[PDB]
Design an enzyme around this catalytic site. Sequence first.
Site, mmCIF file in Angstrom:
data_model
loop_
_atom_site.group_PDB
_atom_site.id
_atom_site.type_symbol
_atom_site.label_atom_id
_atom_site.label_comp_id
_atom_site.label_asym_id
_atom_site.label_seq_id
_atom_site.Cartn_x
_atom_site.Cartn_y
_atom_site.Cartn_z
ATOM 1 N N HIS A 270 0.844 -1.188 0.000
ATOM 2 C CA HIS A 270 0.000 0.000 0.000
ATOM 3 C C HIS A 270 0.881 1.240 0.000
ATOM 4 O O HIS A 270 1.857 1.309 0.754
ATOM 5 C CB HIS A 270 -0.924 0.006 1.216
ATOM 6 C CG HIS A 270 -1.635 1.305 1.433
ATOM 7 N ND1 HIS A 270 -1.378 2.118 2.516
ATOM 8 C CD2 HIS A 270 -2.596 1.929 0.712
ATOM 9 C CE1 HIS A 270 -2.150 3.187 2.452
ATOM 10 N NE2 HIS A 270 -2.899 3.098 1.366
ATOM 11 N N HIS A 315 1.671 11.541 -1.491
ATOM 12 C CA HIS A 315 0.352 11.360 -0.892
ATOM 13 C C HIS A 315 -0.366 12.704 -0.918
ATOM 14 O O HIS A 315 0.029 13.643 -0.218
ATOM 15 C CB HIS A 315 0.449 10.808 0.527
ATOM 16 C CG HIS A 315 -0.858 10.311 1.066
ATOM 17 N ND1 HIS A 315 -1.050 10.004 2.397
ATOM 18 C CD2 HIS A 315 -2.039 10.062 0.450
ATOM 19 C CE1 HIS A 315 -2.293 9.591 2.577
ATOM 20 N NE2 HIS A 315 -2.913 9.615 1.411
HETATM 21 CA CA LIG Z 1 -3.098 5.464 -2.658
#
Ligand SMILES: [Ca+2]
Length: 1070
Positions: A270, A315
């Site tokens: 992830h 992110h």
């Molecule tokens: Ca992602």
Amino acid sequence: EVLHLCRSLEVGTVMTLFYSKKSQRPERKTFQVKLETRQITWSIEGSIDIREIKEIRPGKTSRDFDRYQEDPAFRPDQSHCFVILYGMEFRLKTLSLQATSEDEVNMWIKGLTWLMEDTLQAATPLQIERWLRKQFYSVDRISAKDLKNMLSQVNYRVPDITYGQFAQLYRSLMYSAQKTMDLPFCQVSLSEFQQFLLEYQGELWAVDRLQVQEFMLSFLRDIEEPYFFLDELVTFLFSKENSVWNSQLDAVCPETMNNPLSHYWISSSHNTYLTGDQFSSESSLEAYARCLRMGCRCIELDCWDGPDGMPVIYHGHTLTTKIKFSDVLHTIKEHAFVASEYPVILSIEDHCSIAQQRNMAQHFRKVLGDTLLTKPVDIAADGLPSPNQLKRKILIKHKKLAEGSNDISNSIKNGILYLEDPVNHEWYPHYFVLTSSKIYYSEETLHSSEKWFHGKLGAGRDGRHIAERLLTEYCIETGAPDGSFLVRESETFVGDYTLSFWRNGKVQHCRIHSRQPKFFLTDNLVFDSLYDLITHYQQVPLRFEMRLSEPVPQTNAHESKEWYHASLTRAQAEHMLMRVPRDGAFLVRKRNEPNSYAISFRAEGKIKHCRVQQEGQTVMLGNSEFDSLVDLISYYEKHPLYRKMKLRYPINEEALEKIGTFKCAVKALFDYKAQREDELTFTKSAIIQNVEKQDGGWWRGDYGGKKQLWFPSNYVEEMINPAILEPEREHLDENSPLGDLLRGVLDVPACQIAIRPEGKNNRLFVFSISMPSVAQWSLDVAADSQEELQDWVKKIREVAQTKIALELSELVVYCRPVPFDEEKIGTERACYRDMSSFPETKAEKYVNKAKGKKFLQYNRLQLSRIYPKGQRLDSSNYDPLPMWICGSQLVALNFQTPDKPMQMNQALFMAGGHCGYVLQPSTMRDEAFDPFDKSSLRGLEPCVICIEVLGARHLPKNGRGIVCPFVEIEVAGAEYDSTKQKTEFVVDNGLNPVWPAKPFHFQISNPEFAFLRFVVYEEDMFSDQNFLAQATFPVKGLKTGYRAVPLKNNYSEDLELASLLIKIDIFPAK
Ligand SMILES: [Ca+2]
Ligand code: NA
């Protein structure tokens, strides 16, 4: 051949070291291989252990070299550079090197590549010898006190020397220390060891006597007929050669790689680009190289528009650093198939505009070429292709066009702001998250210096007696040489000093005259400083004649430190510390007993006390030994003392008074009649408002209808600001956007906000949050820039009043994201190419007793991807077993996190040597199977395991003391096969402990989805359990008899020589 080359790297090559430190300029140094220890050393200034090396990368692709890609200070070359990546953690360390010639690089690359593999595969006795070599050179010959300290550093509590003597001493100690183990079996013959292999270990090959011979010689390496000494047999029992793990399973079995892709567990990552937490950690190409080399097959790219038409990866809406899509793609190309031939899936979270999507698709095709999967394997198939059919292929997972066409994502503002600590009044960073309703903020994110100078001891016969005591105490106890000495201020002759030194079992005092500057013993030479004088007489004798030698260390330096209290009861310490609103407040207090102290400190709103004993020239905290209280406290200001708490706030009277600027109120302590026109008049207990605080003795405030007039600051007491107090952690949202990082929550509509123009406390950009309904409540918050300050204020204030590019869609052949439709499962409507993804919370709604069977049916035909919920900003992982057992294939974990889930992941994919694909057992892909109904297993043979933990060797330390180890044994699988057990703990021994007899029994109904897990903990002095080492195995790969359990760290990396010895029997036998 290559051996001659490796011997040449012992000589010394001069190469430029590009330091990882962004400040250290690149320096040139001589690099040598130390074959004796299998290390790399440079000018000795540094040291790499070759067993820690993971990759030897020709070229200039590292962060160290990148610091000079534009800067002309240095110009790294592809041809003259290479990178050594090494370490024990996810984030590898790097040694980036530039050589003077291409032949030198090739030499080091070729040689180290071989030393890497040779060091890792070396027979255990050779590993042990290299370990001893490294230990010895840490201290020709060494003293026995050095030896006691050396053994304490390797987790052994001892209740002239050469290396050979040291080697033999270590050998005898390991054997004698574990004599008592129950081993029903001074020399062991090739025939005795053979019978042992056949009778106890179930090693059938051993019936061939000659293989046993070669087996023993592969272990010994040193010949007539082979045999073992007893100590060597026990050493073998603990060795990797005797591992409980059947290394056969390390190899891929092509025949199990022919089922459809939906039948496999697939090592999945992830947000692969991240190296730390989800909010501010660095994105790095090295994270992609690391995961793919750990066997990861499904990796993730978060794509955002970059500055020059190519996407960057980070992110979204956080402070994570950006990396270039192009650089990521090349890293993938370089590392995708180093560890496995089997396919890699790229899970693309795409936030790019259509134009930069178009460039992605074009770059994918250009860079990856035929490696990229652009067409279906079989347009007539009724299921996904097999891993074997997709070898060397890379698949794009991306949302796809129809033909012809409460977390930090759902957040108003995210960022790092600074709050002022109410105890030490420093600014510290915290994560702030503004939502449509609330602010969440996280937890924090010349002679004076000399040992021989003791200052003023006393003021009469006092000082002399003290000096004599300190010096006698020292010399006797440590057996110090004559001439051991200290210096004090003279009690008799003001301004002068007194030297005291040891001679023939007796103390001698000598007056050191100070005159103005000239310092001198009587009738001796004069010196310009007291330091020069002592430095002189440490080299040539003073007039008997005695050369000064060993300085007496101060044992009482703590008496002047702010945290020390010579007279203070336990209850008195608690009252002082309960007034400090932060954990990490501490003090040290002398106790009634001789040589006894207590550290009192605040943790979790409670006070705790632990004792410290003075024992000679050292102090003891549990079994952790320090030179003095001052050294003890300094260590635990930099290392946790209790759980994760360091010693932070030294508490004395002044600290308590300072525990503490928007609309502040003060209470008057006495009446004050204004002496001047600009002064305020008030009475005792008057509340003075809107106070403007200022050093100098005078504050400004409002009272009695008068506005902003001056008054003495020592006439008032500041009213408490309740905002300094800790929020109630009892009742406090467990699933805020910050997850377990949450510290405080602010109801924004109940707040007002204002900018402080003057700044505050050496910060320029500061705003104040207040609450109209809670007087005196205010929170001063600093930002790093005026622009950020402005954005925060208006967003907070406002809350308080309140297309896909075809070029890229084309590349999605499989892994086509669609919405999950429960009703299509098991029907002709289900499409083997369509997939769905599940945040961990939505996934739990399908991997339970009610829906789990239906999820298994879905996963037999189609892929599901699981990923952690957004609130896991800390990058913690969910338990993957409940997903795997319902057939889920892409169970994405944060690979950078050394928590249990990732230890289970690397354990599961041990089957096949981390090729990244493990075929799900046939029993699970059957119509009947149900993970919450033991009865669905039908006639599967169960498994019973009986274990005894006999001992361990080379357990890792956890800080300064000696671990008190205990071992926890877990079976993990379905809920009905899961349970834990543990031994008692052993006192003060991590190097060679043995455990009492305690037979464990585990029963496994589904041995085909089951793991056997050993975790070694310590029982620390606070009776908490701290992780030390770990080993998790699939049950199918277990061997029997007396077996070694090689241990790993929390990142699943092999620990040097650390292992358990267990007796393990498995039924029914096979
Ligand atoms: Ca992602
Ligand atoms: Na350059």
